[PDB]
Amino acid sequence: LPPAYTNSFTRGVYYPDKVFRSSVLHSTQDLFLPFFSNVTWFHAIHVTKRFDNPVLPFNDGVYFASTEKSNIIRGWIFGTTLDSKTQSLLIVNNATNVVIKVCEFQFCNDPFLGVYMESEFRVYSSANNCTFEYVSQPFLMDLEGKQGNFKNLREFVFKNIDGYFKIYSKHTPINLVRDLPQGFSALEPLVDLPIGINITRFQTLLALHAGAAAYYVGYLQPRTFLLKYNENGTITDAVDCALDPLSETK
Amino acid sequence: GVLTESNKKFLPFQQFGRDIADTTDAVRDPQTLEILDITPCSFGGVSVIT
């Protein structure tokens, strides 16, 4: 599929640390998603050929948003080169939970745990070496099948620093039917991964029936924003302050 | 400091807390998950009147 791009209207804000503040405007410097960016929109409306799941170069943070309601992309395999010699990582939102399986997974020429259940064993062939495996809390993952309006804005931020592969997350129940509209909402941390492996690329584990969906894949950037907390201590506004003269003087 | 019991409300993932001057101001309890203020003790000089 030829990815027809679109515009990122001030999305991708996330509390960078644990600290709390109140009604103060803080100016940080972290890997962020620039405003009004050109997001590599993966139009997943095949009812064309969304089975375009390469080993996408996992840049320094990837705003793997998803306006998907059935989690068609259940999982995300990670690694360096995916050739049976990598202590590779899999974030799989299978029936149990969002399981974090980081092991010396034995890859084949076509590395993917294709659904067949992730039984197309081209990643996992033997748990010969398993440094860790973070089985998360088992929640109501029942092979999600709900669709319709993009209500559950499964916005996801995947950054990997110092071995720690931090996955932020947020769910906002807003009604919308196409690419990211206006509005503002911050993301929270939902897991830190205290591991020490290296990742260079990844994949998007769609649930094979291609298929009809919608999801977007941006790319973060080491910019310097200026946040604005409030009384309740939540981010209500921010400014990408290397974008324009007005933004620079702000 | 004097670990006075706090009043404000933390977001239920936030441990630290600081001020416009960027110094430790509130701390969430690791055990009972409560929030506490902080007020140091350095209190002024000492002058004589004669």
mmCIF file of all heavy atoms in Angstrom, chain A residues 36 240-249:
data_model
loop_
_atom_site.group_PDB
_atom_site.id
_atom_site.type_symbol
_atom_site.label_atom_id
_atom_site.label_comp_id
_atom_site.label_asym_id
_atom_site.label_seq_id
_atom_site.Cartn_x
_atom_site.Cartn_y
_atom_site.Cartn_z
ATOM 1 N N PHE A 36 2.320 19.127 13.776
ATOM 2 C CA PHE A 36 1.984 19.240 12.358
ATOM 3 C C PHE A 36 2.893 18.381 11.487
ATOM 4 O O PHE A 36 3.217 18.748 10.356
ATOM 5 C CB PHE A 36 2.032 20.697 11.897
ATOM 6 C CG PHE A 36 1.148 21.608 12.690
ATOM 7 C CD1 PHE A 36 1.672 22.399 13.693
ATOM 8 C CD2 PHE A 36 -0.208 21.675 12.430
ATOM 9 C CE1 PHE A 36 0.861 23.243 14.424
ATOM 10 C CE2 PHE A 36 -1.025 22.515 13.159
ATOM 11 C CZ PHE A 36 -0.489 23.299 14.157
ATOM 12 N N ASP A 240 5.572 23.114 20.732
ATOM 13 C CA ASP A 240 6.819 22.718 20.092
ATOM 14 C C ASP A 240 7.588 23.988 19.779
ATOM 15 O O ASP A 240 7.306 24.659 18.783
ATOM 16 C CB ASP A 240 6.548 21.908 18.824
ATOM 17 C CG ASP A 240 7.817 21.397 18.166
ATOM 18 O OD1 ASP A 240 8.924 21.739 18.630
ATOM 19 O OD2 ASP A 240 7.707 20.640 17.180
ATOM 20 N N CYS A 241 8.569 24.324 20.611
ATOM 21 C CA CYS A 241 9.139 25.662 20.596
ATOM 22 C C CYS A 241 10.403 25.748 19.750
ATOM 23 O O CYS A 241 11.227 26.644 19.945
ATOM 24 C CB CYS A 241 9.392 26.149 22.020
ATOM 25 S SG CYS A 241 10.860 25.545 22.863
ATOM 26 N N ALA A 242 10.565 24.830 18.798
ATOM 27 C CA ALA A 242 11.384 25.088 17.616
ATOM 28 C C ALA A 242 10.517 24.697 16.425
ATOM 29 O O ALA A 242 10.704 23.647 15.810
ATOM 30 C CB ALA A 242 12.692 24.310 17.661
ATOM 31 N N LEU A 243 9.579 25.554 16.103
ATOM 32 C CA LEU A 243 8.711 25.396 14.947
ATOM 33 C C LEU A 243 8.550 26.680 14.156
ATOM 34 O O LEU A 243 8.493 26.638 12.927
ATOM 35 C CB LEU A 243 7.340 24.885 15.401
ATOM 36 C CG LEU A 243 6.259 24.758 14.330
ATOM 37 C CD1 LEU A 243 6.686 23.760 13.268
ATOM 38 C CD2 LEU A 243 4.938 24.351 14.957
ATOM 39 N N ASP A 244 8.489 27.818 14.834
ATOM 40 C CA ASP A 244 8.081 29.074 14.225
ATOM 41 C C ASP A 244 8.621 30.205 15.081
ATOM 42 O O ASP A 244 9.038 29.987 16.224
ATOM 43 C CB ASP A 244 6.555 29.165 14.112
ATOM 44 C CG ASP A 244 6.005 28.326 12.983
ATOM 45 O OD1 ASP A 244 6.533 28.427 11.856
ATOM 46 O OD2 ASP A 244 5.046 27.564 13.223
ATOM 47 N N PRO A 245 8.633 31.431 14.555
ATOM 48 C CA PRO A 245 9.057 32.559 15.398
ATOM 49 C C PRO A 245 8.177 32.753 16.615
ATOM 50 O O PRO A 245 8.693 32.937 17.724
ATOM 51 C CB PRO A 245 8.980 33.755 14.441
ATOM 52 C CG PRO A 245 9.064 33.162 13.085
ATOM 53 C CD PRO A 245 8.384 31.844 13.165
ATOM 54 N N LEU A 246 6.855 32.733 16.436
ATOM 55 C CA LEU A 246 5.952 32.872 17.572
ATOM 56 C C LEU A 246 6.206 31.791 18.611
ATOM 57 O O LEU A 246 6.282 32.077 19.812
ATOM 58 C CB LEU A 246 4.505 32.824 17.091
ATOM 59 C CG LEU A 246 3.444 33.312 18.072
ATOM 60 C CD1 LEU A 246 3.813 34.683 18.598
ATOM 61 C CD2 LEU A 246 2.090 33.344 17.392
ATOM 62 N N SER A 247 6.339 30.541 18.168
ATOM 63 C CA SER A 247 6.630 29.465 19.104
ATOM 64 C C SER A 247 7.978 29.667 19.776
ATOM 65 O O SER A 247 8.124 29.391 20.971
ATOM 66 C CB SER A 247 6.586 28.124 18.379
ATOM 67 O OG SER A 247 5.290 27.873 17.866
ATOM 68 N N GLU A 248 8.963 30.177 19.038
ATOM 69 C CA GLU A 248 10.280 30.390 19.624
ATOM 70 C C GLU A 248 10.238 31.452 20.714
ATOM 71 O O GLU A 248 10.841 31.280 21.781
ATOM 72 C CB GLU A 248 11.276 30.779 18.537
ATOM 73 C CG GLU A 248 12.712 30.785 19.007
ATOM 74 C CD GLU A 248 13.081 29.520 19.751
ATOM 75 O OE1 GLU A 248 13.412 28.515 19.089
ATOM 76 O OE2 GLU A 248 13.037 29.529 20.999
ATOM 77 N N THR A 249 9.526 32.554 20.472
ATOM 78 C CA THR A 249 9.473 33.598 21.488
ATOM 79 C C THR A 249 8.616 33.179 22.676
ATOM 80 O O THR A 249 8.929 33.538 23.819
ATOM 81 C CB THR A 249 8.979 34.915 20.887
ATOM 82 O OG1 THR A 249 8.887 35.902 21.919
ATOM 83 C CG2 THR A 249 7.630 34.753 20.239
#
